[PDB]
Design a protein around this nucleic acid. Structure first.
Ligand SMILES: Nc1ncnc2c1ncn2[C@H]1C[C@H](O)[C@@H](COP(=O)(O)OP(=O)(O)OP(=O)(O)O)O1
Ligand SMILES: [Mg+2]
Ligand SMILES: [Mg+2]
Lengths: 553, 398
DNA sequence: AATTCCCCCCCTTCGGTGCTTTGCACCGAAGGGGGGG
């Protein structure tokens, strides 16, 4: 029934009226389902008949519920939402079973008719008016208005969550030794005490809820393991995701590729080693969601690997506050990382992957730091404490990186682990000039009208060469000049440039880039054994740097 | 109460609450539980569209958690600040005092009720561990701590309690920026503490800085006998940039030995023209640049740089290439902790000197800063910071 | 050619912003997908 809880005062945005949308022609089965539903609801006072005094209207339809033989009646409140006042949602995240503790007794409850058991503000009911049609336009239609929270309204979820919290507060105040994970209307009540006392307390909770209108039907009340909770199968000592079925097709469209990447990201939290880089690359540049895309022999290998991985049943474990959180990170190549958070060896609380590509140019250390931050900020949410990392990076490499980088870098308490692919810096630029090495005065120019440029590398011993470039801006010509200086040189080399752009790219030791020129720079830099890069102001009378300026111009 | 109002045509704070550590949550639902019994805060629902981040900080050797609300955004749109808008207008003699002390008048703001039509903006949400329950929303009934309008309202209650104290001791200058009392005396340190407890006793009954050690750090050129081609090349670049900040620097006598396509590790034969130009340019760098004046109509900008081995460097300025103050913070392992301590020291120096927190430009990635900056913060106020990515050009500040 | 609403996540695209280097690198919002109620 309708709860005696107080009604949250809602109002429209200033200067806005109510919706006046018209009803679409509905199908016969949906019309019959709506008429059947809007009769039981009307008898219980959840909706009320109206007439000419109400000029508002909003389309209504009915989708099929997750369980068959039941219809969910929704209202297309898309013009009312544009005029409703703003809300601050109180749901800040999603509970995870890895953060649960090992409770001796567990019960999962589901409130029946969750939204239709919370009253709606009396001054806001006139706007939520709708019109059930008559079948074959026999009658002109029956108009109703909502006395409870509508489904499809912007403010309904927050209002219901706050009402449920207020309802549950006295019970949790009386019983502080019982854990209750609430998510909308799904309740996970876990506690100590034997099965008899736990069932007695569950009955007390159900009576308390029934005193507040909310009813918990016996069909949605689970008392024995496994418990289907929030997409997971909670067990007494482990947990698992509900079975994931990947699409199996011989012709892949654009839309069905992202219906496979999405189900792999979800599966990549208890399943270790899931990669979606090659599959996701297939979505770059596509236009239509029905465009057939052929697999590129690299997405097929990833698909086979992920299909093999999903074939073995894996399980998680529950949190233990009297134990230490450990997180291991491993490299996968091409900027992909796989991490697992555990407390005991070979018993993972959680798994995950990080493959985001931030910035045009990067290296392994920066991506490892980003993965560390992501894991830290996720573990803070789930367990409320940072874990101890076991990174695949040497202490000396991290030291040489953070004591020489021009940015503040820190990662928490961490221990080096030696598991093949290691994070390292491929090349380093010497801070001092190298004696007995040819000094390379490079420059590059490009007219900003016809997109023609030239590069020059005139050096100490007398060597010089000017190379023309087509369709290059003022920066690509400089990068080409550096590339050509690096190419025609021995092992030890000193390169002096006149702009900050190339230095800023090169100084932060990139090992992979989104531009082919910087990539060629990187593969050349690793080949050399000693490189010294220096800056010089361009048009300040500096000979050599000015001699090459004439050469490139 | 006072009719607090926002700027013409401004909505209000709508910031998302960041996740908190389990220690900062167990010690935040306890503070807020007791704060609600006394009526300081009250529960609200989702019908209030506004929000503000909240977190707890354990102050210096206090062994107690203190709730801190990041009112940075609400300060920007409040703009009431009219009741004695000056807020104890900045005494120019505060920076010249031998020693000043910072005292936190915290529980004094929790006695004057906040205007009813304003408590909706001072709303915050307390997160839950593993999202067990939806966040608990609260709003302030009394004047909050950290909001710029709290000192501006409590002004005609602190100038009265301090009246029988600062009248007996005219040689003490007391400043209150946001929530802290900057009492700047001039006596001996031993007598300074005695003069502090008397003020503390005065505060109770009626309900360690040293600004004498601050100076600007100028750019210094190296002094070496052997001069290689690279060395002049670095100096020319440094002098070329130094010209725009130190007008009158000439490089004609120095941008002449770099003429040609010679080597870069050979020793240059320094001439008399360069030698005279070197000494002349050094003397201009000796005296700090004059002609710069603080304009209270424009906001200050800070710029921290990392120099390694724990050394940092900042340049507080209002317009580019016109520095009002430069300094070097030494080390006090951790990198974010040092930067966090650097921001507090610069902010404390800026408040003492100009009374305004500068707009910082941190040399750190955003995701690294927001993850850890609340762990080492220990000050009531929070400055507005912007993140930058600029490699060191020519090492032009150290 | 079906039409709804909130929350978290990932992946790609496009426009705005800042510095100057009138291109180029970053960032955030919006589209798609997954999961939950
Ligand atoms: N597709 C949806 N569109 C709009 N609101 C939804 C949707 N799914 C769920 N909700 C909201 C409204 C529901 O009242 C609330 C709880 O979901 P759910 O438990 O599935 O429904 P219910 O409690 O109304 O019916 P039941 O009797 O089957 O429990 O979540
Ligand atoms: Mg359900
Ligand atoms: Mg239900």
């Amino acid at each position: 029934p309708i709860s005696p809880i107080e009604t949250v005062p809602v109002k429209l945005k200033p200067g806005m009226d109510g919706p006046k949308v018209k009803q679409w022609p509905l199908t016969e089965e949906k019309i019959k389902a709506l008429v059947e539903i809007c009769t039981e609801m009307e008898k219980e006072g959840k909706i009320s008949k109206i007439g000419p005094e109400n000029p508002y209207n909003t389309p209504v339809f009915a989708i099929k519920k997750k369980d068959s033989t039941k219809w969910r009646k929704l209202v297309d409140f898309r013009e009312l939402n544009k005029r409703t006042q703003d809300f601050w949602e109180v749901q800040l995240g999603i509970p995870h079973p890895a953060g649960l503790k090992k409770k001796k007794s567990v019960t999962v409850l589901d409130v029946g008719d969750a939204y239709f058991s919370v009253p709606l503000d009396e001054d806001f009911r006139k706007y939520t008016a709708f019109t059930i049609p008559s079948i074959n336009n026999e009658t002109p239609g029956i108009r109703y208005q909502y006395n409870v929270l509508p489904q499809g309204w912007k403010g309904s979820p927050a209002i219901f969550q706050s009402s449920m919290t207020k309802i549950l507060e006295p019970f949790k105040k009386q019983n502080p030794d019982i854990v209750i994970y609430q998510y909308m209307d799904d309740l996970y009540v876990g506690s100590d005490l034997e099965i008899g006392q736990h069932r007695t307390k569950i009955e007390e909770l159900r009576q308390h809820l029934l005193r507040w209108g909310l009813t918990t039907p016996d069909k949605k009340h689970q008392k024995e393991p496994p418990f289907l909770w929030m997409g997971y199968e909670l067990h007494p000592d482990k947990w698992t995701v509900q079975p994931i079925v990947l699409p199996e097709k011989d012709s892949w469209t654009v839309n069905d590729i992202q219906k496979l990447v999405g189900k792999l990201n979800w599966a990549s939290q208890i399943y270790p080693g899931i990669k979606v880089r090659q599959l996701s690359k297939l979505l770059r540049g596509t236009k239509a969601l029905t465009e057939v895309i052929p697999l590129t022999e690299e997405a097929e290998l990833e698909l086979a690997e992920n299909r093999e991985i999903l074939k073995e049943p894996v399980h998680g474990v529950y949190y233990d506050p009297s134990k230490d959180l450990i997180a291991e990170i491993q490299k996968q190549g091409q900027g992909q990382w796989t991490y697992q958070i555990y407390q005991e060896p070979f018993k993972n609380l959680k798994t995950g992957k990080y493959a985001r590509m931030r910035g045009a140019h990067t290296n392994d250390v920066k991506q490892l730091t980003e993965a560390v931050q992501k894991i830290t900020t996720e573990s803070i949410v789930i367990w409320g404490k940072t874990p101890k990392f076991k990174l695949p990076i040497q202490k000396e490499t991290w030291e040489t990186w953070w004591t020489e980088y021009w940015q503040a870098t820190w990662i928490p308490e961490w221990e080096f682990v030696n598991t093949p692919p290691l994070v390292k810096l491929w090349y380093q630029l010497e801070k001092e000039p190298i004696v007995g090495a040819e000094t390379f005065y490079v420059d590059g120019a490009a007219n900003r009208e016809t997109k023609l440029g030239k590069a020059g590398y005139v050096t100490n011993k007398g060597r010089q060469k000017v190379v023309p470039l087509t369709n290059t801006t003022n920066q690509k010509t400089e990068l080409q000049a550096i590339y050509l200086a690096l190419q025609d040189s021995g092992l030890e080399v000193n390169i002096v440039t006149n702009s900050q752009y190339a230095l800023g790219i090169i100084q932060a030791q990139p090992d992979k880039s989104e531009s082919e020129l910087v990539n060629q720079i990187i593969e050349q830099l690793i080949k050399k054994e000693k490189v010294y890069l220096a800056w010089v102001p361009a048009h300040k009378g500096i000979g050599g740097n000015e001699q090459v300026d004439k050469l490139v111009s | 109460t006072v009719p607090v109002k926002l700027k013409p045509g401004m909505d209000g704070p709508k910031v998302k609450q960041w996740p908190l550590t389990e220690e900062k949550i167990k010690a935040l639902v306890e503070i807020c539980t007791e704060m609600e019994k006394e009526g300081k805060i009250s529960k609200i629902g989702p019908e209030n569209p506004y929000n503000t981040p909240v977190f707890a900080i354990k102050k210096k050797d206090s062994t107690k958690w203190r709730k801190l609300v990041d009112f940075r955004e609400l300060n920007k749109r409040t703009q009431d600040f009219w009741e004695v808008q000056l807020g104890i207008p900045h005494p120019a003699g505060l920076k010249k005092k031998k020693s000043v002390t910072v005292l936190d008048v915290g529980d004094a703001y929790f006695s004057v009720p906040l205007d009813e039509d304003f408590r909706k903006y001072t709303a915050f949400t307390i997160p839950s561990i593993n999202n067990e329950t939806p966040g608990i929303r609260y709003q302030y009934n009394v004047l909050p701590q950290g909001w710029k309008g709290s000192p501006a309202i409590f002004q005609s209650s602190m100038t009265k309690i301090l009246e029988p104290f600062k009248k007996q001791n005219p040689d003490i200058v007391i400043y209150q920026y946001m929530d802290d009392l900057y009492v700047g005396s001039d006596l001996e340190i031993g007598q300074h503490r005695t003069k502090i407890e008397e003020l503390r006793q005065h505060l109770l009954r009626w309900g360690e800085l040293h600004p004498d050690k601050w100076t600007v750090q100028p750019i210094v050129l190296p002094e070496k006998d052997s001069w290689t081609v690279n060395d002049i090349q670095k100096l020319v670049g440094k002098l070329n940039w130094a010209s725009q900040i130190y007008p009158g620097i000439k490089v004609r006598q120095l941008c002449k030995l770099l003429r040609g396509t010679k080597a870069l590790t050979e020793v240059i034969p320094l001439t008399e023209e360069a030698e005279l130009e070197l000494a002349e340019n050094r003397e201009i760098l000796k005296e700090p640049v004059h002609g710069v004046y603080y304009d209270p109509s424009k906001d200050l900008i800070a710029e921290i740089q990392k120099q390694g081995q724990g050394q940092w460097t900042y340049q507080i300025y209002q317009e580019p290439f016109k520095n009002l103050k430069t300094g070097k913070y030494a080390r006090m392992t951790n990198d974010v902790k040092q930067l966090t301590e650097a921001v507090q020291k610069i902010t404390t120096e800026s408040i003492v000197i100009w009374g305004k927190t500068p707009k910082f430009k941190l040399p750190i990635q955003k995701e690294t800063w927001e993850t850890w900056w609340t762990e080492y913060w220990q000050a009531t106020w929070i400055p507005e910071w912007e993140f930058v990515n600029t490699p060191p050009l020519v090492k032009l500040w150290y």
